[PDB]
Design a protein around this ligand. Structure first.
Ligand SMILES: [Mg+2]
Ligand SMILES: [Mg+2]
Ligand SMILES: [Mg+2]
Ligand SMILES: [Mg+2]
Ligand SMILES: [Mg+2]
Ligand SMILES: [Mg+2]
Ligand SMILES: [Mg+2]
Ligand SMILES: [Mg+2]
Ligand SMILES: [Mg+2]
Ligand SMILES: [Mg+2]
Ligand SMILES: [Mg+2]
Ligand SMILES: [Mg+2]
Ligand SMILES: [Mg+2]
Ligand SMILES: [Mg+2]
Ligand SMILES: [Mg+2]
Lengths: 152, 83, 114, 100, 99, 127
RNA sequence: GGUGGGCACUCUAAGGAGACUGCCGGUGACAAACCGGAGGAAGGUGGGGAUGACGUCAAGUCAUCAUGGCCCUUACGGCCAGGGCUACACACGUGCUACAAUGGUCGGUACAAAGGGUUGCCAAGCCGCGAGGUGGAGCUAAUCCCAUAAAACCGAUCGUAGUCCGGAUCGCAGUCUGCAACUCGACUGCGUGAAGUCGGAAUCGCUAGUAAUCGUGAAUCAGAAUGUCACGGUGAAUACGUU
């Protein structure tokens, strides 16, 4: 807000893989304060990924995020009769959080049996870049480039 | 429901009036204000004018109302229909 | 078998479907005569299916239960007590609100005049 | 908070304290398992013989200064809007404004 | 072996009373074990402050009850009973046991 | 010999004794794995040892009271940090950099008058 | 810690210490001040509370109380028995419970804080499926009672169905308080099993131990809380910025 007074809060507590991104994803998949349930869900999804194929789950997860984080975003501004949607390069910190949120959001509506399996399926699909999340990402990019006349 | 440690509840005056009136069989409704009272099995066939809230309405006692209470046979609110 | 009992289900859960036996009653039936409620009735021998039939034929099922319930309802209906009068207008008979929120006994919303 | 209200409620606790003991053994006889109905019914009719305005459950306590039915605190004897007056003047011992 | 219990609504005068009883306890030459601070009760009330409808208009009060425990060994001269009038004056409640 | 430490976190208090040994680890006369069952509590309680890399050298005796699982774990970590400082008083810098000796003073905010939770409010219909 | 015992600790509650831009670097009208760093449990009024300037809205209260005038004085004053404030074609405000698989049941086990109790709490044992009943111990309470915390963790099952989801409504049989549970109490057992598949226009709270979720206590009170006031367990996302 106007003050610019609140600095960031750092918590880094990966229990069995020693990765910060995994802990942040556990934060994203959490609901109503269930830390341990989220850890179980994430570990089950990674174990399903490990069992399905020879690929190790951590690298698959990381390169699935790298194939889903958007590059530019659309932000609206009115001028008194029309609101134009200018593109802005997403900050290096925003892209990771946006990717995680999109991944978990489209995992929640995947439609198959359990949340662990839904995450597993989404990670497998995103590692190759064919899920609904990558469709959303490319939609965002095409919308942003279609409004490149404003850019500034 | 009343505890079965004391099943029957009956007002003393109404009880004695009914159990006195049994000698001369049903000839006039017994007017009363005690809706809390429960029908005794031994008073069947006699008519009781129970208080409604402004007047006393008459009820005739058969076997299928022994375990109930007097107040259930005198409705206190009217509601003759909204329209 | 039974009266259109649903198969491919655990014994107690399927037994629940008989309108007069719930969950404690179904497991009581399963316990009175030795059967495993973990076993699907699809896999139970007739020599014990008829045993469950004998156990179920002891209390009440379907037609007689509805008959006695309706007899009680009609008795209340025709006595003329407050319960009967409240029970013939299609209104809650146990003292709940009627100013608002008595929708399960009053069905749809059904507006007001025009 | 009329005068009649206070007077009649005062008469109520006076009448309750009048007997205040026969209720005890009457209810004990009613509630006693090894009592038999023969004398338990007699205790019932004896209990119902007493005036109706004698039970403890008919006592509705009011403010000792205004006779107000609502807003009562039983640690003190006063109501909602006189306890504040007594406390803020320092009359009530031990009571202070608390933050914690 | 006697037991001494003190209660008060505030700590100034109960501390003073504890100090004076314990110094009188040394005076007779009896051993003493120090003052035990017991947990203090705290009872709270919330009261509406308007004569009519304002529910969030509330004021909150509390009462604190302080306790202290003392005991002595080998007594011979008991003027504490003979000074009971002076020992407790205004707002200190004193209990004695096993005299 | 031996060293003492006390830890406090989220109304959870912990007494920690450091002795020479081979990391027996006892909490309320029962084992660590039997105390914290398959969660991050083991790593978070273990960190102040590998940060100073003396996990094998020290046997640890622990008594705990109050709070929940996470508060208990944080209190144990704080107590072990303090005792370890009391043992080898030159490694203050490492634990300060890790932010281990800093006692977190966050507590449960008191409920307010006119509010449901500490900050939640009714819905404020304006008409 | 059952005992002797100790006064280490924890804790309890009184007295004190500590954080004040104090020291260093830079910016600054070598002023106030601003941005950093060290030390430290805490750094920039550390966190939370209480405390509401002159006045405004002829704001609210004559029904807590007090008070000027007016009004009733065989009634607008009193006592009693019943009924009503609990009605019900409908509209609105505030909440609880759900619509499930981050879940529902069955079994095993771990960890709190605050508080109430001698016209009171009301144990152990025994009897009931259960509400509950007998019993009488201890406690004027850091001692006895309320009084097993729940979510979490471990194992099995249910496999996407209006269902082992959801519990409304209704029938039968009961317990307790109370002179008295019909109008019109709260809980228990058996059966029944409704709408509900995440909600149009619109709209609300929240910046960290916060929101979200899980339990516990108290006042009022014979009996009667999804309300109010409090206590802890687990425990986030986001803030580029001021068009
Ligand atoms: Mg007057
Ligand atoms: Mg009352
Ligand atoms: Mg520092
Ligand atoms: Mg607090
Ligand atoms: Mg609104
Ligand atoms: Mg700064
Ligand atoms: Mg600093
Ligand atoms: Mg104020
Ligand atoms: Mg006006
Ligand atoms: Mg007005
Ligand atoms: Mg009356
Ligand atoms: Mg009302
Ligand atoms: Mg169910
Ligand atoms: Mg704010
Ligand atoms: Mg809380």
């Amino acid at each position: 807000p106007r003050r610019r007074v609140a600095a960031k809060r750092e918590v880094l507590a990966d229990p069995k893989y020693g990765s910060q991104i995994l802990a942040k994803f556990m934060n994203h998949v959490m609901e109503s304060g269930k830390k341990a349930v989220a850890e179980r869900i994430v570990y089950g999804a990674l174990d399903k990924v490990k069992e399905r194929g020879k690929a190790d789950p951590l690298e698959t997860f990381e390169k699935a995020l790298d194939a889903i984080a958007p590059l530019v975003e659309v932000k609206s501004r009115r001028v008194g009769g029309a609101t134009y949607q200018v593109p802005v390069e997403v900050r290096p910190s925003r892209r990771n959080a946006l990717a995680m949120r999109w991944l978990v959001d489209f995992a929640r509506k995947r439609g198959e049996k359990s949340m662990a399996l839904r995450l597993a399926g989404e990670l497998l699909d995103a590692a190759e870049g064919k899920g609904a999340a990558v469709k959303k990402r490319e939609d965002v990019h095409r919308m942003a480039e279609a409004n490149k006349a404003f850019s500034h | 429901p009343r505890s079965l440690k004391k099943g029957p509840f009956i007002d003393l005056h109404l009880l004695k009036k009914v159990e006195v009136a049994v000698e001369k069989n049903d000839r006039k409704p017994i007017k009363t204000w005690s809706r809390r009272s429960m029908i005794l099995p031994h008073m069947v066939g006699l008519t009781i004018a129970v208080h409604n809230g402004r007047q006393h309405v008459p009820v005739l006692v058969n076997e299928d109302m022994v375990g109930h209470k007097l107040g259930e046979f005198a409705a206190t609110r009217t509601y003759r229909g909204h329209a | 078998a039974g009266v259109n009992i649903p198969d491919n289900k655990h014994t107690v859960i399927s037994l629940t479907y008989i309108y007069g036996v719930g969950r404690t009653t179904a497991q009581s039936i399963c316990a009175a005569t030795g059967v495993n409620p973990a076993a699907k009735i699809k896999d139970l021998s007739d020599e014990q299916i008829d045993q469950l039939r004998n156990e179920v034929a002891k209390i009440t099922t379907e037609g007689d239960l509805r008959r006695e319930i309706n007899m009680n309802i009609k008795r209340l209906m025709d006595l003329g007590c407050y319960r009967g009068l409240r029970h013939r207008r299609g209104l809650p008979v146990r003292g709940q609100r009627t100013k608002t929120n008595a929708r399960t006994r009053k069905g749809p919303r059904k507006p007001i005049r025009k | 908070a009329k005068e009649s209200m206070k007077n009649r409620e005062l008469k109520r606790q006076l009448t309750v304290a009048k007997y205040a003991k026969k209720r005890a053994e009457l209810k004990a006889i009613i509630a006693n398992p090894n009592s038999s109905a023969e004398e338990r019914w007699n205790a019932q009719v004896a209990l119902q013989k007493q005036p109706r305005d004698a039970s403890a459950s008919r006592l509705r306590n009011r403010c000792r200064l205004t006779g107000r039915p609502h807003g009562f605190y039983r640690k003190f004897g006063l109501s909602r809007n006189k306890l504040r007056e007594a406390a803020m003047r320092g009359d009530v011992p031990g009571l202070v404004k608390a933050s914690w | 072996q006697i037991r001494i219990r003190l209660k008060a609504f505030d700590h100034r005068l109960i501390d003073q009373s504890t100090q004076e009883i314990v110094e009188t306890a040394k005076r007779t030459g009896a051993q003493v074990r120090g003052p035990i601070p017991l947990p203090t009760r705290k009872e709270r009330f919330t009261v509406l402050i308007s004569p009519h409808v304002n529910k969030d208009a509330r004021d909150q009060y509390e009462i604190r009850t302080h306790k202290r425990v003392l005991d002595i060994v080998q007594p011979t001269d008991k003027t504490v009973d003979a000074l009971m009038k002076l020992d407790l004056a205004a707002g200190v409640e004193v209990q004695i046991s096993l005299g | 010999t031996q060293n003492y430490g006390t830890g406090r976190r989220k109304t959870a208090t912990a007494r920690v004794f450091l002795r020479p040994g081979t990391g027996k680890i006892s909490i309320n006369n029962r084992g660590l794995d039997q105390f914290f069952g398959r969660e991050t509590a083991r790593m978070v309680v273990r960190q102040p040892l590998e940060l100073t890399e003396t996990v094998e050298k020290f046997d640890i005796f622990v008594t705990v009271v109050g709070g929940g699982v996470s508060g208990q774990a944080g209190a144990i970590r704080h107590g072990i940090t303090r005792a370890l400082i009391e043992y080898d008083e030159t490694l203050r810098s490492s634990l300060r950099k890790a932010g281990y000796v800093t006692r977190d003073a966050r507590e449960v905010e008191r409920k307010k008058v006119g509010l449901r939770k500490a900050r939640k409010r009714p819905q404020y219909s304006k008409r």
